[PDB]
């Protein structure tokens, strides 16, 4: 129950009468009560890695012994809620302090005891009925939007001896009462899990969904899957608040996680101020973002160890979430300051220095990290099917990709959005540079679309091979100028800038275009290599007559067309329905097959 | 067999990273194995690193996270790590610690087999002559693979490794114009590295001869350092107790190079090389040198360690030490898949110690190792062409350098370039050989004498 | 459409061989189960107890 | 993927919930051609083993224990029990609903089926109208969800009813519609 | 007599009660008696570096203590064996044991005791008369090569009251009784010697006649001298195996003795499998060089403690055979190795490390080892003159050479055959670096070049020029290509890139290329340097005159005379005998001459 303080030397406490506590066990250093981890054990001296400042605790100070590794503190409350990376609600103890500190040992609950949950028992439910690990005993109407399952933690079965009625209850209150082998368990609405133990599901399925965020370059040239891995590079005018905009409104997922993860001060005020703000419209009402997002924010002046559990933190409760039926969007802003918050701690254990003075495990670190991404069925009776998709982004050194950290990332994930700067001051948002870009789960979704769009496996690939062309000849241009370029080479040139300026760049803010679904997506593409399809025809087919067709002759012709295909984007997807676009779109192919024809 | 009950001791002095330390230990002996029962009735596993006295050092494989001082129980088995080893282990899936995970029982042991094995008397040791036919050109061509022969597959994170080792899982053969039981085990790999191996042993008819030990990214990092162990113990049952041929892959050696790493942190053991430990070369050795055939068995063990360059650096010491150890390597080229050349090999770097005795006159053609060395000394010449252009550009290069470009461009397009089901003879990559070298005039090939060259250049 | 056929049979002839398999089994086990059984006994019953080797005086 | 002790509490759970879905899809015992498909799993339910006798069980293999299998069952039967949920007052023929039972155990995967996003539409629509408040858009949404929830009672959602496809376009599109 | 085991850390176990035990003793730890060596002593407990693995040792355990230093038993029965690193017949034991493994403390005799050998006494000897250290006493018909002399162990002296009458004699029957002060001393044909003490000899004499190796490059540019020592730095796969290997087969040492210290057991047994089939003439008959080789091997999975052992053992048996008159040769497979058991035993112990974790005494061991090389007046009472070349393989980490292994012994041995990594990958085997490698001995040797190979030191002295001037022209033509080039600079690279690729690069692995006698040798570079000289003349006396001689004229003129001398590798020296291949090598020069001669 109960330690001393035996010493203190900088953030290390050494615990007297510690003869039962258990490794990486929590424990309430001081008077003050802060937080520290168990670090190694000897006879009944615990030493003790202490998250805050350590000054001012003195021996003799009690050391309470909490029960538990550092666990995130699962349940409702959730939704909404901006925590630190050791489950602090920054924006509980603000309200109960009245104060712009956090205070030192503060010991505020992770969820609110005292907020009141409307809680309905699953109506099969009885007493004496058989439940295991993973099943939903109930349903908490958290908001509008989100509709909290309340489940059986893992590792817990047995015979339910009392279900609540469906009524108002804390997280403080019994919700359920089972017994095995004669032990009885009370379950409350609240469960807790170590953020470091992944959360058990019946199976890990592969993933075979898009992860669509309505971006056209995103979707179609490299698209995620719900459960995928990216990475997204970090610097200052990328635009990694498009895609995080991007997933938090737009995307299918059921939830957001965004996980701060130790960023500068102003730029965590930044992201707390903006989510709050974003709003999504589901089922015709403008919602906001925050009904169904967490937020774990937590700066660079954070306990280290905060800092470095925020990773895990984040995937615990995205695990949560998913384990919930949902499909959850974990972000890590930037795994370097993470990666930077493990080396601190290594070298304040005074490990070996590993490549480049990182620790001797942070390869398996971020791989195990990643693991935890994907597509499951989740563990419980009711059969589920969640997913967490981590979009954790790191920042290379002055845009290298070498340092360990991004290294690891890259070799680990599956896909890489590559935001550029340089796009971004040539005005082509988003600024992927869809060149570095990549993402290997192309083969995965071929059944998807084959299913579905069928075709937008052969326009991609066609606009891929468009654009590396383009690339090629923008070497040989420079060498002999345009003049000097064949017609195929010209027809090339000018379809890719088409597809550069007029498919790849999108406009966030404007109604038509801030969100562009995925029919929307494959139907320009079509039209445009429809076009390039074509007028390569023209010009090959032309090459053996004396009245050889040429780009010059085929923009002359069909200046209306090109107009056309340019404006293909200002389709509104809400006021021009999937129909009407689609006919638009088949009505602007049948006008260039009619203009291609009596021009050829 | 040891018919004394065995000790259980709450005498848990101290816990630091993952070396629980029990005290008052009766007799410890070292290495021995010991079963430790947490608080929470968890029930995890460990070796004794060291005894001194009445102490133990105990480096548990789970880790030592929720150990407790006065709670934990560990129970001493009196016995070195021994693997139950059963024919019937052919078509199992295990985890890193030799555990069912396929949901059958456990393995029946036909024998009770230490997991270190023992090294084989050198002069026992028969010497790898049989060429296999991996059915890749730039294998069997230029770094022909001999039965009983440890190559590795260097690789980089995000290259085709897997498929290239299914690939010669798929169509390895001898050259004689019998199958290949396969132990395959996993050191940290991703759910999908591992669901396609299996899935691909499954495609094939080969799930009844693969053995699976997986040890995946979320799995303990210390029972890396057993996986290797137990793969290689059953395959030494299947090959020299059983008469089996056995291809033993181990996937990610870096990771169980980095969990060796970790551990030796942990024990703060002298660093070599980028801070790996200073016997790093002995432990691979102990894990790469259980392969080749023996006398008077008919077994063999051919190892094929698929290890990740860190940043494609073959220097570094995992890559590096595995080169000293085995008998070659198999380097495969980021340069060459960014192209979307596959197999993505790089003959250069790569290297098969066995192929100068398993090539000739019998085995395989009298001309491979004319042709393999010409294939070797015109690409070589043909990258030095390619060097020397991007700096003095295409007007400058003569007739000679033209001609090596060409062959160049053909070698990486007809010969390393080759489809993922295509299963050329060793007889068709020296023919491609041939025809790749007959660009030159017989007067630019000086590897090859004039003898072999009247006899194979004019066709 | 018409593939479907041929998972039956193959279900039912291996089925077959897994039960005649086990039939084996079980008769080699019933046949040679009580020399077992007796050798086990008799050798957990038999004690013996010694001290470690490395223990003196 | 899950230690034996969790997977064999997880066959146990599995068990319980087909038995729960049973109970609640038929209360009356009349859906006999799935209870008698049901049988070898829902013998552990008619007669009260505990908790501990019932993972004995099927630790020894005596109850069916394929967790995979279970899973295929129990999540035929979890669809079927949505469908008839989901149009809670029509209720559905018996030769109706054994038929859809059947249909949904031919199909290769219930989780991509069409009778799953066909349920999932319709839950979305109910689930709408069991909170939203009395407005034109609801009054509407209402309307047309009734109409729907017949049209699936008398037909069903294993088939490729133009009217039953026509009330799912429009309902969704005037969900997803704006309020204003 | 008996200690107890008190720790294991590895290979390094803890005794207790061992008061007297003397450093550097021999002991045998455990039930098993697995051998182990003394190598610190504190308080009454010593620490003992184990030569077998120590997996299994309990605390308690006993500890024998042997009041002897690690040594070798010496006498015939050493040459055809292959031991392991403390001398323990590996053939015998296979016999012994039948099983592929060795046994963990085996205790087979090192020398048989069974075999009867053929011993004829010297004939001068007689009761009474006065003998001495290293006194050639005996000699037995060991076999075809080897007449293994019979001397009495150093350290032992007296007047001979027993000569055993020619006969068969096992190695256990006295063979020789004397007496010295009184005391009388018994000995058979075998003799203990410590393995860390050097055998004494008269005098160490300057070494004054090559080591012939059958390698064009080490033969010529870099030669080597009986009593040398010699480094083979160089990354893996870039031959240094293969270098010991050709020198173990062809060479004029009248032993060899492997050592494969912590390297493959497959190339051991590689060398078993060869060797027996390679014979060497001698007296018309054809007698198998393993008769004269002896291996010790010790692959790099057996025990790591037991490197060291293997290094002194084969050095031990090097000098008992450099002792009868023989010029051995001891090729130390990898002393990486070594070091690398040097510095884990270093570990265990809890040593302050010096560069890169080596222990401090790294450099002090190595150059200890090498002394033991130089040719030597052989101790005893007949004038013989011995030898050991030391021929020590290097394998530096990552192929820095800047590894303290390598500097280490760069720092003492006087060849130092340098490879490179680029030319093994373009299969130039053998893979040495012309400009880094050299050799000490050439002002050495040059008093028998001159006497022997008259013309041959001008010529290897025109080669190294030949070479650093190819060097040069090929740094600067890099950046500037072959444009501006000279004439004569063409000359030379051209020249340079024939002597690469045709007289230093040697295929080990041929029938013409595996041994090159240095008859070969020399005529090859003659002829070469020979065309150097006739093209440099005709360009430089013809650059005045209008019809102005340039290498593309010599080029075209002399294709056939440049495939002719590229092709001059490829005589045999087997099927095709000296005399023909000097024959045609004369006929070559003469084309060149009269060829040159025509175009000029
Ligand atoms: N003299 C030679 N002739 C032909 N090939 C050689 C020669 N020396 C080395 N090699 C090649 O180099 C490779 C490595 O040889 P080895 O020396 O055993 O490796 P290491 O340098 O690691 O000891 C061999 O596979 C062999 O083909």
Same mark, same amino acid.
């Given at each position: 129950?109960?330690?001393?303080?035996?010493?203190?030397?900088?953030?290390?406490?050494?615990?007297?009468?510690?003869?039962?506590?258990?490794?990486?066990?929590?424990?309430?250093?001081?008077?003050?009560?802060?937080?520290?981890?168990?670090?190694?054990?000897?006879?009944?001296?615990?030493?003790?890695?202490?998250?805050?400042?350590?000054?001012?605790?003195?021996?003799?100070?009690?050391?309470?012994?909490?029960?538990?590794?550092?666990?995130?503190?699962?349940?409702?409350?959730?939704?909404?809620?901006?925590?630190?990376?050791?489950?602090?609600?920054?924006?509980?103890?603000?309200?109960?302090?009245?104060?712009?500190?956090?205070?030192?040992?503060?010991?505020?609950?992770?969820?609110?005891?005292?907020?009141?949950?409307?809680?309905?028992?699953?109506?099969?439910?009885?007493?004496?009925?058989?439940?295991?690990?993973?099943?939903?005993?109930?349903?908490?109407?958290?908001?509008?939007?989100?509709?909290?399952?309340?489940?059986?933690?893992?590792?817990?079965?047995?015979?339910?001896?009392?279900?609540?009625?469906?009524?108002?209850?804390?997280?403080?209150?019994?919700?359920?009462?089972?017994?095995?082998?004669?032990?009885?368990?009370?379950?409350?609405?609240?469960?807790?899990?170590?953020?470091?133990?992944?959360?058990?599901?019946?199976?890990?399925?592969?993933?075979?969904?898009?992860?669509?965020?309505?971006?056209?370059?995103?979707?179609?040239?490299?698209?995620?899957?719900?459960?995928?891995?990216?990475?997204?590079?970090?610097?200052?005018?990328?635009?990694?608040?498009?895609?995080?905009?991007?997933?938090?409104?737009?995307?299918?997922?059921?939830?957001?996680?965004?996980?701060?993860?130790?960023?500068?001060?102003?730029?965590?005020?930044?992201?707390?101020?903006?989510?709050?703000?974003?709003?999504?419209?589901?089922?015709?009402?403008?919602?906001?973002?925050?009904?169904?997002?967490?937020?774990?924010?937590?700066?660079?002046?954070?306990?280290?160890?905060?800092?470095?559990?925020?990773?895990?933190?984040?995937?615990?409760?995205?695990?949560?979430?998913?384990?919930?039926?949902?499909?959850?969007?974990?972000?890590?802003?930037?795994?370097?300051?993470?990666?930077?918050?493990?080396?601190?701690?290594?070298?304040?254990?005074?490990?070996?220095?590993?490549?480049?003075?990182?620790?001797?495990?942070?390869?398996?670190?971020?791989?195990?990290?990643?693991?935890?991404?994907?597509?499951?069925?989740?563990?419980?009776?009711?059969?589920?099917?969640?997913?967490?998709?981590?979009?954790?982004?790191?920042?290379?050194?002055?845009?290298?990709?070498?340092?360990?950290?991004?290294?690891?990332?890259?070799?680990?994930?599956?896909?890489?959005?590559?935001?550029?700067?340089?796009?971004?001051?040539?005005?082509?948002?988003?600024?992927?540079?869809?060149?570095?870009?990549?993402?290997?789960?192309?083969?995965?979704?071929?059944?998807?679309?084959?299913?579905?769009?069928?075709?937008?496996?052969?326009?991609?690939?066609?606009?891929?091979?468009?654009?590396?062309?383009?690339?090629?000849?923008?070497?040989?241009?420079?060498?002999?100028?345009?003049?000097?370029?064949?017609?195929?080479?010209?027809?090339?040139?000018?379809?890719?800038?088409?597809?550069?300026?007029?498919?790849?760049?999108?406009?966030?803010?404007?109604?038509?275009?801030?969100?562009?679904?995925?029919?929307?997506?494959?139907?320009?593409?079509?039209?445009?290599?429809?076009?390039?399809?074509?007028?390569?025809?023209?010009?090959?087919?032309?090459?053996?007559?004396?009245?050889?067709?040429?780009?010059?002759?085929?923009?002359?012709?069909?200046?209306?067309?090109?107009?056309?295909?340019?404006?293909?984007?200002?389709?509104?997807?809400?006021?021009?329905?999937?129909?009407?676009?689609?006919?638009?779109?088949?009505?602007?192919?049948?006008?260039?097959?009619?203009?291609?024809?009596?021009?050829? | 067999?040891?018919?004394?009950?065995?000790?259980?001791?709450?005498?848990?002095?101290?816990?630091?990273?993952?070396?629980?330390?029990?005290?008052?230990?009766?007799?410890?002996?070292?290495?021995?194995?010991?079963?430790?029962?947490?608080?929470?009735?968890?029930?995890?596993?460990?070796?004794?690193?060291?005894?001194?006295?009445?102490?133990?050092?105990?480096?548990?494989?789970?880790?030592?996270?929720?150990?407790?001082?006065?709670?934990?129980?560990?129970?001493?088995?009196?016995?070195?790590?021994?693997?139950?080893?059963?024919?019937?282990?052919?078509?199992?899936?295990?985890?890193?610690?030799?555990?069912?995970?396929?949901?059958?029982?456990?393995?029946?042991?036909?024998?009770?087999?230490?997991?270190?094995?023992?090294?084989?008397?050198?002069?026992?040791?028969?010497?790898?002559?049989?060429?296999?036919?991996?059915?890749?050109?730039?294998?069997?061509?230029?770094?022909?693979?001999?039965?009983?022969?440890?190559?590795?597959?260097?690789?980089?994170?995000?290259?085709?490794?897997?498929?290239?080792?299914?690939?010669?899982?798929?169509?390895?053969?001898?050259?004689?114009?019998?199958?290949?039981?396969?132990?395959?085990?996993?050191?940290?790999?991703?759910?999908?590295?591992?669901?396609?191996?299996?899935?691909?042993?499954?495609?094939?008819?080969?799930?009844?001869?693969?053995?699976?030990?997986?040890?995946?990214?979320?799995?303990?990092?210390?029972?890396?350092?057993?996986?290797?162990?137990?793969?290689?113990?059953?395959?030494?049952?299947?090959?020299?107790?059983?008469?089996?041929?056995?291809?033993?892959?181990?996937?990610?050696?870096?990771?169980?190079?980095?969990?060796?790493?970790?551990?030796?942190?942990?024990?703060?053991?002298?660093?070599?090389?980028?801070?790996?430990?200073?016997?790093?070369?002995?432990?691979?050795?102990?894990?790469?040198?259980?392969?080749?055939?023996?006398?008077?068995?008919?077994?063999?063990?051919?190892?094929?360690?698929?290890?990740?360059?860190?940043?494609?650096?073959?220097?570094?010491?995992?890559?590096?030490?595995?080169?000293?150890?085995?008998?070659?390597?198999?380097?495969?080229?980021?340069?060459?898949?960014?192209?979307?050349?596959?197999?993505?090999?790089?003959?250069?770097?790569?290297?098969?110690?066995?192929?100068?005795?398993?090539?000739?006159?019998?085995?395989?053609?009298?001309?491979?190792?004319?042709?393999?060395?010409?294939?070797?000394?015109?690409?070589?010449?043909?990258?030095?062409?390619?060097?020397?252009?991007?700096?003095?550009?295409?007007?400058?290069?003569?007739?000679?350098?033209?001609?090596?470009?060409?062959?160049?461009?053909?070698?990486?397009?007809?010969?390393?370039?080759?489809?993922?089901?295509?299963?050329?003879?060793?007889?068709?990559?020296?023919?491609?050989?041939?025809?790749?070298?007959?660009?030159?005039?017989?007067?630019?090939?000086?590897?090859?004498?004039?003898?072999?060259?009247?006899?194979?250049?004019?066709? | /459409?018409?593939?479907?056929? &041929? #998972?039956?049979?193959?279900?039912?002839? $291996?089925?077959?061989?897994?039960?005649?398999? @086990? /039939?084996?089994?079980?008769? &080699? #086990?019933?046949?040679?189960?009580?020399? $077992?059984?007796?050798?086990?006994?008799?050798? @957990?019953?038999?004690?013996?107890?010694?001290?470690?080797?490395?223990?003196?005086? | 993927?899950?230690?034996?002790?969790?997977?064999?509490?997880?066959?146990?759970?599995?068990?319980?919930?087909?038995?729960?879905?049973?109970?609640?899809?038929?209360?009356?015992?009349?859906?006999?051609?799935?209870?008698?498909?049901?049988?070898?799993?829902?013998?552990?339910?008619?007669?009260?083993?505990?908790?501990?006798?019932?993972?004995?069980?099927?630790?020894?293999?005596?109850?069916?224990?394929?967790?995979?299998?279970?899973?295929?069952?129990?999540?035929?039967?979890?669809?079927?029990?949505?469908?008839?949920?989901?149009?809670?007052?029509?209720?559905?023929?018996?030769?109706?609903?054994?038929?859809?039972?059947?249909?949904?155990?031919?199909?290769?995967?219930?989780?991509?089926?069409?009778?799953?996003?066909?349920?999932?539409?319709?839950?979305?629509?109910?689930?709408?109208?069991?909170?939203?408040?009395?407005?034109?858009?609801?009054?509407?949404?209402?309307?047309?969800?009734?109409?729907?929830?017949?049209?699936?009672?008398?037909?069903?959602?294993?088939?490729?009813?133009?009217?039953?496809?026509?009330?799912?376009?429009?309902?969704?599109?005037?969900?997803?519609?704006?309020?204003?």
């Amino acid at each position: 129950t109960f330690g001393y303080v035996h010493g203190v030397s900088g953030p290390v406490v050494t615990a007297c009468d510690m003869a039962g506590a258990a490794m990486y066990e929590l424990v309430r250093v001081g008077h003050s009560e802060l937080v520290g981890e168990i670090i190694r054990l000897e006879g009944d001296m615990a030493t003790i890695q202490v998250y805050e400042e350590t000054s001012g605790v003195s021996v003799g100070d009690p050391v309470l012994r909490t029960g538990k590794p550092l666990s995130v503190e699962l349940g409702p409350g959730i939704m909404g809620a901006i925590f630190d990376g050791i489950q602090r609600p920054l924006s509980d103890i603000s309200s109960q302090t009245q104060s712009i500190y956090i205070p030192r040992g503060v010991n505020v609950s992770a969820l609110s005891r005292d907020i009141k949950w409307e809680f309905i028992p699953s109506k099969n439910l009885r007493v004496g009925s058989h439940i295991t690990g993973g099943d939903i005993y109930g349903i908490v109407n958290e908001n509008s939007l989100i509709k909290h399952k309340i489940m059986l933690p893992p590792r817990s079965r047995g015979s339910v001896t009392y279900i609540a009625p469906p009524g108002n209850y804390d997280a403080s209150d019994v919700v359920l009462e089972l017994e095995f082998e004669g032990v009885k368990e009370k379950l409350s609405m609240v469960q807790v899990w170590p953020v470091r133990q992944v959360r058990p599901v019946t199976e890990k399925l592969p993933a075979n969904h898009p992860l669509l965020t309505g971006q056209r370059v995103l979707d179609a040239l490299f698209p995620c899957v719900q459960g995928g891995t990216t990475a997204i590079p970090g610097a200052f005018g990328c635009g990694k608040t498009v895609i995080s905009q991007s997933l938090s409104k737009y995307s299918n997922s059921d939830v957001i996680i965004y996980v701060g993860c130790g960023e500068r001060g102003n730029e965590m005020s930044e992201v707390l101020r903006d989510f709050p703000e974003l709003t999504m419209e589901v089922d015709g009402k403008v919602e906001s973002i925050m009904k169904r997002t967490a937020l774990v924010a937590n700066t660079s002046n954070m306990p280290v160890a905060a800092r470095e559990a925020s990773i895990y933190t984040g995937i615990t409760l995205s695990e949560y979430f998913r384990d919930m039926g949902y499909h959850v969007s974990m972000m890590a802003d930037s795994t370097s300051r993470w990666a930077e918050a493990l080396r601190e701690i290594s070298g304040r254990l005074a490990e070996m220095p590993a490549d480049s003075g990182y620790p001797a495990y942070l390869g398996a670190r971020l791989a195990s990290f990643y693991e935890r991404a994907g597509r499951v069925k989740c563990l419980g009776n009711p059969e589920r099917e969640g997913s967490v998709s981590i979009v954790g982004a790191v920042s290379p050194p002055g845009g290298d990709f070498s340092d360990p950290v991004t290294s690891a990332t890259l070799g680990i994930v599956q896909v890489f959005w590559g935001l550029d700067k340089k796009l971004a001051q040539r005005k082509h948002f988003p600024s992927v540079n869809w060149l570095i870009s990549y993402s290997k789960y192309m083969r995965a979704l071929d059944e998807y679309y084959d299913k579905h769009f069928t075709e937008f496996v052969p326009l991609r690939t066609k606009a891929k091979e468009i654009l590396q062309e383009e690339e090629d000849l923008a070497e040989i241009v420079q060498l002999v100028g345009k003049a000097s370029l064949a017609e195929t080479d010209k027809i090339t040139l000018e379809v890719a800038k088409l597809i550069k300026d007029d498919f790849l760049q999108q406009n966030g803010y404007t109604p038509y275009d801030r969100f562009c679904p995925f029919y929307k997506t494959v139907g320009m593409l079509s039209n445009m290599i429809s076009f390039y399809d074509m007028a390569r025809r023209a010009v090959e087919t032309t090459a053996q007559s004396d009245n050889k067709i040429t780009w010059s002759i085929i923009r002359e012709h069909m200046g209306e067309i090109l107009y056309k295909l340019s404006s293909m984007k200002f389709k509104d997807p809400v006021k021009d329905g999937e129909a009407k676009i689609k006919a638009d779109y088949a009505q602007l192919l049948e006008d260039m097959q009619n203009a291609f024809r009596s021009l050829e | 067999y040891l018919s004394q009950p065995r000790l259980t001791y709450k005498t848990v002095s101290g816990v630091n990273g993952p070396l629980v330390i029990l005290d008052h230990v009766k007799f410890p002996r070292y290495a021995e194995i010991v079963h430790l029962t947490l608080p929470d009735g968890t029930k995890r596993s460990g070796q004794v690193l060291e005894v001194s006295g009445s102490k133990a050092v105990v480096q548990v494989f789970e880790g030592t996270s929720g150990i407790d001082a006065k709670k934990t129980s560990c129970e001493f088995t009196g016995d070195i790590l021994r693997t139950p080893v059963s024919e019937d282990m052919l078509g199992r899936v295990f985890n890193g610690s030799g555990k069912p995970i396929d949901r059958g029982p456990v393995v029946l042991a036909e024998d009770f087999l230490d997991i270190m094995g023992q090294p084989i008397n050198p002069q026992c040791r028969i010497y790898p002559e049989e060429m296999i036919q991996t059915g890749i050109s730039a294998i069997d061509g230029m770094n022909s693979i001999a039965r009983g022969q440890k190559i590795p597959i260097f690789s980089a994170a995000g290259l085709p490794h897997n498929e290239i080792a299914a690939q010669i899982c798929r169509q390895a053969g001898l050259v004689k114009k019998e199958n290949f039981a396969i132990v395959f085990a996993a050191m940290g790999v991703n759910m999908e590295t591992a669901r396609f191996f299996k899935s691909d042993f499954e495609e094939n008819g080969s799930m009844d001869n693969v053995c699976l030990f997986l040890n995946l990214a979320n799995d303990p990092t210390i029972e890396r350092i057993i996986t290797p162990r137990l793969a290689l113990t059953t395959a030494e049952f299947l090959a020299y107790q059983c008469e089996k041929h056995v291809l033993v892959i181990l996937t990610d050696m870096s990771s169980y190079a980095e969990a060796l790493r970790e551990v030796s942190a942990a024990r703060e053991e002298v660093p070599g090389r980028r801070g790996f430990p200073g016997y790093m070369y002995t432990d691979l050795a102990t894990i790469y040198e259980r392969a080749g055939r023996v006398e008077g068995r008919n077994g063999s063990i051919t190892q094929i360690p698929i290890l990740t360059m860190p940043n494609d650096d073959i220097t570094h010491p995992i890559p590096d030490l595995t080169g000293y150890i085995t008998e070659g390597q198999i380097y495969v080229d980021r340069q060459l898949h960014n192209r979307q050349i596959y197999p993505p090999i790089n003959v250069l770097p790569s290297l098969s110690r066995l192929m100068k005795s398993a090539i000739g006159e019998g085995m395989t053609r009298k001309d491979h190792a004319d042709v393999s060395n010409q294939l070797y000394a015109c690409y070589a010449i043909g990258k030095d062409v390619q060097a020397m252009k991007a700096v003095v550009g295409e007007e400058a290069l003569t007739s000679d350098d033209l001609l090596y470009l060409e062959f160049l461009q053909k070698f990486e397009k007809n010969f390393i370039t080759q489809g993922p089901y295509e299963n050329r003879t060793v007889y068709e990559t020296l023919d491609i050989g041939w025809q790749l070298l007959r660009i030159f005039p017989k007067e630019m090939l000086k590897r090859i004498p004039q003898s072999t060259l009247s006899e194979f250049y004019p066709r | /459409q018409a593939a479907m056929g &041929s #998972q039956g049979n193959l279900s039912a002839e $291996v089925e077959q061989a897994t039960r005649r398999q @086990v /039939q084996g089994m079980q008769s &080699s #086990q019933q046949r040679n189960r009580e020399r $077992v059984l007796t050798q086990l006994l008799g050798m @957990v019953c038999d004690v013996r107890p010694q001290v470690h080797p490395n223990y003196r005086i | 993927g899950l230690t034996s002790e969790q997977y064999h509490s997880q066959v146990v759970g599995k068990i319980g919930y087909i038995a729960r879905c049973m109970q609640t899809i038929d209360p009356e015992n009349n859906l006999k051609k799935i209870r008698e498909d049901y049988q070898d799993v829902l013998i552990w339910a008619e007669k009260n083993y505990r908790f501990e006798e019932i993972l004995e069980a099927s630790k020894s293999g005596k109850c069916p224990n394929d967790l995979d299998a279970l899973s295929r069952r129990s999540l035929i039967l979890q669809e079927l029990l949505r469908l008839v949920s989901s149009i809670s007052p029509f209720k559905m023929k018996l030769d109706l609903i054994e038929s859809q039972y059947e249909k949904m155990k031919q199909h290769v995967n219930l989780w991509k089926s069409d009778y799953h996003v066909k349920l999932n539409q319709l839950n979305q629509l109910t689930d709408y109208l069991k909170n939203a408040a009395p407005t034109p858009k609801n009054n509407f949404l209402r309307a047309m969800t009734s109409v729907l929830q017949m049209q699936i009672a008398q037909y069903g959602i294993t088939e490729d009813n133009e009217g039953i496809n026509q009330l799912f376009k429009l309902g969704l599109h005037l969900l997803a519609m704006a309020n204003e």
